[PDB]
Amino acid sequence: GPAFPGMGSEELRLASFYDWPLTAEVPPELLAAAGFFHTGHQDKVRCFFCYGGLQSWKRGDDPWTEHAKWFPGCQFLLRSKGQEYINNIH
Numbered sequence: 001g002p003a004f005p006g007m008g009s010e011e012l013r014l015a016s017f018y019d020w021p022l023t024a025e026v027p028p029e030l031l032a033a034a035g036f037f038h039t040g041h042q043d044k045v046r047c048f049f050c051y052g053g054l055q056s057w058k059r060g061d062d063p064w065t066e067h068a069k070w071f072p073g074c075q076f077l078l079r080s081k082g083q084e085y086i087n088n089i090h
């Protein structure tokens, strides 16, 4: 199961970005779609399922791509995007 079941709702994850510092550079809609919620600190986010933490976001970073780069074992990512997608990013 998920590391943090309470952030399994996409709606709740998106709500967590109300004070995201990088709205234009990396959209909260995309981050939340990709399983991430804002911690509230700087630009640190975390996946509800694998608990993986990503910070230091650059403009145009794609949340799903970064999810697969760093946490390719995540089952939420596998379920959502498929193995071929993860394989191609590596």
Ligand SMILES: CN[C@@H](C)C(=O)N[C@@H]1C=CC[C@H]2SC(C)(C)[C@@H](C(=O)Nc3cc(C)nn3-c3ccccc3)N2C1=O
Pocket: 039, 044, 045, 046, 052, 053, 054, 055, 056, 057, 058, 061, 066, 070
């Ligand atoms: C350029 N695009 C960025 C999204 C990126 O590649 N991210 C970092 C690239 C350098 C190192 C990797 S290792 C990592 C997957 C664990 C992650 C990272 O450095 N995370 C981290 C380290 C520490 C001491 N805390 N956190 C962290 C980040 C976010 C939430 C909670 C904890 N990380 C990154 O977040």
Ligand SMILES: [Zn+2]
Pocket: 035, 047, 048, 049, 050, 051, 052, 067, 071, 074, 075, 076, 077
């Ligand atoms: Zn994950």
